[PDB]
Symmetry: C2
Amino acid sequence: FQGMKKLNTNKLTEEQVNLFKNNLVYLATVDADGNPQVGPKGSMTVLDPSHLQYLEKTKGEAYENIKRGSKVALVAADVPSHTAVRVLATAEVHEDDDYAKKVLAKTEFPNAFVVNLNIEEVFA
Amino acid sequence: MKKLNTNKLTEEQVNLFKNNLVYLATVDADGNPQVGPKGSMTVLDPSHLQYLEKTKGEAYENIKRGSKVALVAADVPSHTAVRVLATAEVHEDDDYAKKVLAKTEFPNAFVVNLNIEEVFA
Ligand SMILES: [Cl-]
């Protein structure tokens, strides 16, 4: 995998959208001491080239960091090609509002939280 | 995943690092997070890991400015995973780096040693 550079856009290309769609995404947040945290998120989807969404089922450290104001970094990597894309995003969390209810009605996790991610920057 | 109150990997956690793709995360000096895969990650002992920095990209720049380093080794199908928080020591072309890289095709990479501060699972 190559070093990534800032692409000076907040819009994914189609190839990058397909990276996010087709691979297990990893997400990183920042804890209360300013340290990183990282873990996999299987429920990631792409709403449009500047917005992603996932379900927060565990409500663990990532969620607590986000609730405390952390920004979110995401990566989607394709090992066979060694291609990857990363984003920096701000999180918009929907716990039990009508938007959450609408989104979750299409899933089997009615008590999850719906986290939308507004892409600020793309790196590749 | 919860703090285990140790800086030492268990045998199961060593195997998780050995058998799965590891992801690394850092923060820039303003606190914005970064995350990416690290295929060269290796456990040296229960409290130390090591990887190669071949590209010297954003994780590198963040570490240079003092970022601590988070790692995860997840076997997602098996529902097992381990996370660490560590500090880095960067070896660019000292005798240690040379010794390590002699066993690789990457003689100009930097060697980054990670000292585990906390394990989570
Ligand atoms: Cl495109």
